Point group: C4
Chain length 166, copies 4
């Protein structure tokens, strides 16, 4: 029971990683109900008293949730860009043109890596200029991403800057 | 009375959102603003026999100038309705009773400044439009709608997106100032956004720990 | 005498703004220059009869060096007028009592550092101009003034906008370094910004906490 | 002995700068490297009859590993000199008293992390040229030296400039990752840059108050 909770947290991280990714990339309709597995995060929400023993554990958890929200935003971004694609506008067409794989199109690995890279650059406020929103849906998604990204950036990194002394 | 002032705050936020938009993007329904101004007249009637002179000596004039209809550049006089923000500024103690309320107020004012700067950005872009240098021409080309050009929705979304990116210090590169007026306004927006982040999110860090 | 210090501070701000700008751009009004020189001569005269010996060893040499005209490129020696900053540097006791004064000083030093970096950026971009890779060629190509070339106003606004975007961590992508000297200067600007942005905005957050 | 400690710190900085640069770029002078090796041999000799037992069972293994010549890939095997950083990491007491030497050390480790990331970035980029995709091809196109391509100076300056921009969250848009390896490396660089910003410059904000 002492080490059961760490394994439970690792498996909940696994399922919270691989449910949105599958539901956003691998469909290419009753299987959509599998998205309800995300409710398992309440276990790690309620086990904070046991998880927060060490400050390095809190830093690892903060990095993990930042990466997790980046992954979820990447999945949403790919879903948005995939809905518009079969209807040179949109990020998927530009990505296919850039890597020399005209839309066929880029492989799933390339699309996921591009989406995660764009989401990380937006959340960290770098904006490399390689990937830029170009449609109304993409622009509104970007606006929401920067809003909640300012919020989560402030909260997460203020917590980190408070803990680092400890 | 608390519910009344919270509803007053909601209506103040509504008019602050909808006045600059109608000033800039419109003038190329009215039932909502008619209801809002009628309800604000009801509020000023509530705010006023012994305390009427005290209120008249205090904040009566500021509300009065912001409550007189301008029905008779001619249509631009409605920008004076933005003065109602001090109605919320004067009673900030009531709103600062909870940490969540302060957090929501900070986010709301950040979005409100972004909206106001978006309206100013569109006004700057439009005043130079009839003179491929401005941002409106680039927007038209990128969206595949070369200059009727982009619609009102596309133009507002692009202005808000550029303003949010500049304030948050992302700089996506899709929209970049190209004329001197755009460059100066962008410098001002960068300073405003730096101040926004510093002050607001220092306050946010202060609240979250408690 | 009571208000002489703030007038001297304003004069120092003026010369700090207009000496690097003149040296970097206008080398290829004199009345205000003469007025400023006469005002500084008056200041050094009244700064002084048993205390003259104390000043002779204290700060007279620096003020005398910064006050002597160099007219006999003779204009490059006029950069010595930038030495007047020690007058406000040493008098920090008076200027650090009002919190609003401290905030205004921080804003002015941010703007001054950005202006100096813009002047250095233009000097770098112009020293390599006669040698399609520099930022001046791209600026001329993108604003519709192909090299001729852009006006002085356009060049200054572009340089200041690039410097502000670099210091504020926006990086708009309109102006991007494309030469070894430009890239090295951009790295130096990145380091100086990492220090100065953090320090100044931490101080500003501290004042806001008050 | 303090002079010896500071000289050893300077030599540690030198080797941490020049062995990864050599490994990344110069593969496919030596007098200074030989002098530094002899100096570190002198240092490990100095590190030593009652005290030799403590050193032999203490830090002698790491120092011996970092001091044994590998002149029998040798160019890649010379990287084993990077373990000399423990020699400064284990004497942090001596380098924490000036109150500004530690700030200089923070700036130096900023520059060192940026330089190492630049070396890794160039190592990633150069391995893909045999296989207009890649940052080296774009660099060649931009600076007007199409792929023989850019010189070693241009490649190093571009790599360091991109790494600094990524860490400092500017993203100038001149250099942008395009391959999966470049994108993943950039993701990692952004993450470590954010974390290092938080930690290191929280420490810097704490230190600048004194
Ligand atoms: O405001 C925001 N809204 C946002 C919304 C979403 C996401 C982020 C948002 N953000 C902030 C993100 C962090 N960013 C400051 C980084 C300091 C940086 C630096 C460097 C040089 C410089 F000149 C200025 C700033 C630096 C980086 C690494 C370091 F090690 C040290 C300092 C300010 C914008």
């Amino acid at each position: 029971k002492a080490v059961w909770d760490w394994l439970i947290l690792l498996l909940v991280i696994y399922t919270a990683v691989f449910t949105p990714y599958s539901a956003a990339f691998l469909l290419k309709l009753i299987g959509l109900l599998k998205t309800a597995r995300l409710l398992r995060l309440v276990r790690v929400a309620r086990k904070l008293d046991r998880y927060s023993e060490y400050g390095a554990a809190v830093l690892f958890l903060l990095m993990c949730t930042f990466a997790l929200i980046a992954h979820w935003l990447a999945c949403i971004w790919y879903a948005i860009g995939n809905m518009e694609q079969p209807h040179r506008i949109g990020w998927l067409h530009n990505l296919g043109d850039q890597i020399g794989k005209p839309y066929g199109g880029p492989s799933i690995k390339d699309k996921y890596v591009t989406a995660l890279y764009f989401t990380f650059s937006s959340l960290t406020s770098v904006g490399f200029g390689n990937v830029s929103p170009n449609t109304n849906s993409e622009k509104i998604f970007s606006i929401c991403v920067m809003l909640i990204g300012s919020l989560m950036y402030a909260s997460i990194f203020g917590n980190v800057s408070a803990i680092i002394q400890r």
